[PDB]
Structure 1
Amino acid sequence: GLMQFTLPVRLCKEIELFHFDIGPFENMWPGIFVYMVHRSCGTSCFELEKLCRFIMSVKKNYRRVPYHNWKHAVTVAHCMYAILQNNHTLFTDLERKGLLIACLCHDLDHRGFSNSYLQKFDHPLAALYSTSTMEQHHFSQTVSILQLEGHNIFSTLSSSEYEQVLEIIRKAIIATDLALYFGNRKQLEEMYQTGSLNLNNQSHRDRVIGLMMTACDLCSVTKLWPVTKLTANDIYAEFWAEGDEMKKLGIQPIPMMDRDKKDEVPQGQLGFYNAVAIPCYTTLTQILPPTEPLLKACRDNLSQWEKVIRGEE
């Protein structure tokens, strides 16, 4: 009850900032997550015994892949923590509960391969889930873990609040399918500009939470340059492995995934920043002004990639 998580001074201060890196000490990440739940939601919203057991089962169901791993899960949860803490009064109690858990669970049992590779491989999951293949699997894995004995962290919610929070988590995890991001942001851009955007309109909130999920999911591009640059290695380690597996199916992979075309990564990063990341954080800053530091950090990293091409690094 009166058992608070407390971080060392540097972490206590820096965890509040959007560009916080959770560090290389894996055994501190569960504590970092509980700390964020306690401060973002309250010391009462989850039973610590059940939360701790849920966290360790979620950890166990992330794989030993270069990028789509347990560290990514906690990193994405921290970006969501930073957004919720900088927008105190905009979100309900259930939303704050749902979204931290959604971010922690959003890539459960990821194998480091895209929806495209599963379909071309003809993986069983592609027959079970025709669109947002891995994202439907991630939500399925979340419900499975919630249903383990002693793992239902929502047990003390009413029946309607329980159905609401599982609905929040489902939409939040589906929204991390980047194929859905393009149309979601376009609609939000139209609604903001025409002035029709209404946060009391449930379908509008859903769209805003989807954009928050894209923003947290892509947040490696909002870190200090050395973190962004070193995370890019892990991201491209998976892309190149997938490229290898495409060549084994007798398919030339797109340049993004071809380890022979390593030279084209810097220009590939420019396209991603300009087509995905900058537009994402721009629209997010328009709807939620206090998230502006994510856009500023993203712009700084675009400028660093431009310097890489110009041979200045």
Structure 2
Amino acid sequence: GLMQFTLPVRLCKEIELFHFDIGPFENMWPGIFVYMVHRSCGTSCFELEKLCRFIMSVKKNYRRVPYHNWKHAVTVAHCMYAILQNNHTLFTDLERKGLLIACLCHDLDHRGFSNSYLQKFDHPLAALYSTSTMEQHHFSQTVSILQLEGHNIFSTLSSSEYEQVLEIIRKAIIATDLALYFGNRKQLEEMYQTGSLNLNNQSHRDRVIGLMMTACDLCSVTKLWPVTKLTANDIYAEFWAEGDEMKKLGIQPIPMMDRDKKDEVPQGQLGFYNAVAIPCYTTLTQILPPTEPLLKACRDNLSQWEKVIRGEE
């Protein structure tokens, strides 16, 4: 019980900042995650032996894809850590427990392909799960790992608390389906403005947790520019592979996924920042004022992409 994780001084300090990059040393990522659980939840939230076995089984079930990989999982969990630590009193003990685990698990067994590609391929997962195809799969994989012998990190929870945390995790992972983000944020925008937003209303909390999940999932756009720019390469490496596989099915891919149209990427990023990222962090900042640094960092990166177009880099 008296065993803390301690990070080197630079990491101890920078891990608290929204724009923290977890670095290229894969062997430090489990420790970084446990550190965040301990400060965010408590040294008592999970049996360390069970947590460590859970983390390593989750790691093993992420694939060697350019972007939707183990580093993404830990990166998304860290953004959630930063949101939770800057909003100390707004979240229940169960929520803090559930949401870091949800973020670590949210892309389990990702193959580097969109729901659209699974559907056009006629992948079996598309038959099993007609909407949020990969996200239902990710939740399924999370449940499977929790049910491995010695992997049930929620064992000390009562039966009702166990049902509540699995429900928090299921909704959180489904919410990472970007197709669902647009309507979720629209409803949150309406509720904030008409003043009807009520954090004691479970359906309202669900919506707010959904937006937090989108914010954490997209957090590549809230890093310092050199991290954002280098991460963009990894995201486009997957999209360009999917575009190649679309062409193999005899379907012209959307320009975003066509490696023949690399020139259009800067303009595609503006659309994304304007249509998705900025609105996401804006609505999040309205509901949770201390998440403003995410919106400010996102705005800084929008300005960097505008400079790429203007040939200034």
TM-score when scaled to structure 2?
1.00
Task: Give 1:290 deviation, angstroms.
Answer: 0.1
SS class of match (1:88): coil
Task: Give 1:84 deviation, angstroms.
Answer: 0.1
Task: Give 1:27 deviation, angstroms.
Answer: 0.1
How many angstroms apart in 1 are the aligned matches of 2:85 and 2:76? 14
Q: Could you say which residue in structure 2 is the equivalent of 1:258?
A: 258
How many angstroms apart in 1 are the aligned matches of 2:204 and 2:72? 27
CA deviation map 1:73-105 (0-9, x unaligned): 000000000000000000000000000000000
How many angstroms apart in 1 are the aligned matches of 2:45 and 2:34? 11
CA deviation map 1:2-21 (0-9, x unaligned): 00000000000000000000
SS class of match (2:89): helix
How many angstroms apart in 1 are the aligned matches of 2:285 and 2:8? 31
How many angstroms apart in 2 are the aligned matches of 1:43 and 1:201? 30
Task: Give 1:157 deviation, angstroms.
Answer: 0.1
Structure 2: any 5+ residue segments left out of the alignment? none
Q: Could you say which residue in structure 1 is the equivalent of 2:60?
A: 60
Task: Give 1:311 deviation, angstroms.
Answer: 0.2
Task: Give 1:162 deviation, angstroms.
Answer: 0.1
Task: Give 1:178 deviation, angstroms.
Answer: 0.1
How many angstroms apart in 2 are the aligned matches of 1:215 and 1:134? 19
TM-score when scaled to structure 1?
1.00
Task: Give 1:165 deviation, angstroms.
Answer: 0.1
Task: Give 1:141 deviation, angstroms.
Answer: 0.0
Task: Give 1:149 deviation, angstroms.
Answer: 0.1
Task: Give 1:286 deviation, angstroms.
Answer: 0.1
Kindly report the root-mean-square deviation, in angstroms, between the aligned alpha carbons of the 2 structures: 0.1
CA deviation map 1:24-63 (0-9, x unaligned): 0000000000000000000001000000000000000000
How many angstroms apart in 2 are the aligned matches of 1:232 and 1:37? 28
Structure 1: any 5+ residue segments left out of the alignment? none
How many angstroms apart in 2 are the aligned matches of 1:203 and 1:254? 35
Q: Could you say which residue in structure 1 is the equivalent of 2:274?
A: 274
How many angstroms apart in 2 are the aligned matches of 1:277 and 1:185? 11
CA deviation map 1:175-205 (0-9, x unaligned): 0000000000000000000000000000000
Task: Give 1:252 deviation, angstroms.
Answer: 0.3
How many angstroms apart in 2 are the aligned matches of 1:132 and 1:226? 32
How many angstroms apart in 2 are the aligned matches of 1:260 and 1:253? 10
How many angstroms apart in 2 are the aligned matches of 1:192 and 1:45? 33
- Counterparts of 1:137-176 in structure 2 under 5 Å? 137-176=137-176
CA deviation map 1:257-301 (0-9, x unaligned): 000000000000000000000000000000000000000000000
